[PDB]
Amino acid sequence: PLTLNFGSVRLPVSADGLLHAPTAQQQLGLTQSWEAALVEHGLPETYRDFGAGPEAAVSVPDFVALAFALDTPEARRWQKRARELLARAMQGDVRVAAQIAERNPEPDARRWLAARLESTGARRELMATVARHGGEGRVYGQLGSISNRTVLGKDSASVRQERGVKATRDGLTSAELLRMAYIDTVTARAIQESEARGNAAILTLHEQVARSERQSWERAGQV
Amino acid sequence: APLTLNFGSVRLPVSADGLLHAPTAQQQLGLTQSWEAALVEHGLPETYRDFGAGPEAAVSVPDFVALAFALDTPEARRWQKRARELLARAMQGDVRVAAQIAERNPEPDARRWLAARLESTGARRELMATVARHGGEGRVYGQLGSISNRTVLGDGLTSAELLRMAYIDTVTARAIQESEARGNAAILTLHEQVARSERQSWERAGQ
């Protein structure tokens, strides 16, 4: 017995993420029978157990498409939720980010999220330390380029292509994010204790940190 | 410095207080009319912000989104589509989306607030599991956690301490796998080595 909690609505959902169609019809103000709707809209005939035996199901994307096709008061409310969501997403609203993460059925997905957010925390801290210590455009990307090469082995474009992503960090493992997070934590220390200057050893130190990390990682397979 | 709002492949210049550069918003929405024409037709406020090149017209993100839905240009339709995909992905709990949203909020308090509501990074848990599949047993689960603590320390943790320990658990799990370590003795030895090296690097890189 599972629901997809979105804003104020609770939609019954299957183990594999499909919505209970009867509920979907109510949410979209669809009033005809479900097979009337399947025929009219070209939707699959598919069944899922929502705790009361086999019932008609609809994918989330299909639900969303129907919301953007129908003009019922109900459908227009869902279009409205899509407008508000995009605005809040574009603005970085972490409450929305939390709600999204909570809807994920896999605890492991959130462990990955935490790994990502912490490696980003570390990466930014390195940026902030770097700026405060002779900030120069070009340095920010030189630092990332070093990390990608040492941790992933390929340029960010190579990885974006190889792994099917629009951004490298959407395709990285927890381990890769943690290896990168570690390197940034170390470099930020070295400079803020070894007092480096400008864009030279701040890139010299980062190179040293990343290559040591690289060896440590390869060394784990030697030990 | 000048800022950009990143959304997928799109890069929108953005003011310090979150307003978008209007001329660029117009290219993104296919609004070929002048901005004055647009301000009148759509009820938008006249707002100027400095995006690095002196005051230029600005539009809020909510207003931008409303225009995308109000319009029916190929370009506005692209944005309507991004909104549909976003909705589906948010409803499905997509954590790459949640990550993208959190990364667009620059405030450490926001990121900390979000991290504070999540399970941990999982490095510790996954080490435990590797250890068990490699024949570890009993006390070893408690000993591995204690060894990391004496190395790094000596929610009250700093971010650096957290990452040092995540890093240590991550490396150990690898060392146990690439090596075909078996049993508690072998496992404890690897963990004590990884944790010693991490400590040395921390002190040494410091110098």
Domain locations along chain B: 3-107, 123-206
Does B196 contact chain A (CB < 8 Å)? no
- What are the residues whose beta carbons fall under 8 Å from the beta carbon of A159, sequence distance 6 or more? A148, A152, A165, A168, A171
| CB–CB contact A115 B123 (8 Å) | yes
| CB–CB contact A113 B113 (8 Å) | no
Contact B93, A108 (CB under 8 A): no
Angle at B111 between CA B104 and CA A60, to 5 degrees: 65
Does B66 contact chain A (CB < 8 Å)? yes
Residue appearing with tokens 């068990």: B132
Contact B205, A209 (CB under 8 A): yes
Neighbours of B157 (CB within 10 A): 12
Q: What SS3 class is residue A72? A: coil
Contact A101, B115 (CB under 8 A): no
Element (H, E) at A182: helix A174-194
Obtained via which technique?
Answer: X-ray
Measured between alpha carbons, how far is A20 from B198 in angstroms, rounded to an integer? 51
Residues of A in contact with B92 (CB under 8 A): 17, 60, 103-104
Measured between alpha carbons, how far is A41 from B11 in angstroms, rounded to an integer? 35
| Structure tokens that stand for B104 in this block | 């667009």
| Structure tokens that stand for A67 in this block | 């919301």
- Provide the CA B82 distance to its chain's centre, in angstroms: 20
Helices and strands (H, E) in chain B, number of each type: 10, 5
Contact A97, B88 (CB under 8 A): no
Q: How far is CA A204 from CA A139, A191, A196, A198, in A?
A: 11, 10, 9, 11
φ, ψ of residue A150 to 5 degrees: the values are -75, -35
Does A65 contact chain B (CB < 8 Å)? yes
Measured between alpha carbons, how far is B162 from B155 in angstroms, rounded to an integer? 9
- What are the residues whose beta carbons fall under 8 Å from the beta carbon of A211, sequence distance 6 or more? A150
Residue appearing with tokens 């770097």: A130
Max CA pair span of chain A: 72
Q: Is B52 left (phi over 0), alpha (psi -120 to 50) or beta?
A: left
| CB–CB contact B190 A101 (8 Å) | no
| Structure tokens that stand for A19 in this block | 């919505």
| CB–CB contact B114 A117 (8 Å) | yes
- Exposure letters A95-123 (e unless 16+ CB within 10 A, then b): ebbbbbbebbeeeebbbbbbbbbbbbbbb
Resolution of the coordinates, Å: 2.2
> In the Cβ-directed half-sphere of B8, how many Cα atoms lie within 13 Å?
10
Q: What SS3 class is residue B13? A: strand
**CB burial of residue A159 (10 Å; 0-12, 13-18, 19+):** buried
Neighbours of B76 (CB within 10 A): 18
Written as one letter, the residue type at B119 is: E
Residues of A in contact with B113 (CB under 8 A): 94
| Pick among B94, B167, B169, B172 to test the A interface (most A CBs inside 10 A) | B167
Measured between alpha carbons, how far is B93 from A99 in angstroms, rounded to an integer? 8
Residues of A in contact with B164 (CB under 8 A): 182, 185
Q: What is the DSSP string of A13-81?
A: B-TTS-EEHHHHHHHHT--S-HHHHHHHHT----EEESSSSEEEEE-HHHHHHHHTT--SHHHHHHHHH
Does B185 contact chain A (CB < 8 Å)? no
Q: Of A62, A75, A66, A58, which Cα lies nearest the Cα of A13? A: A58
User: What is residue A50's DSSP assignment?
Assistant: S
Q: Of A201, A71, A168, A183, which Cα lies nearest the Cα of A122? A: A183
For chain B, give the residues followed by a break (C–N over 2.5 Å).
154
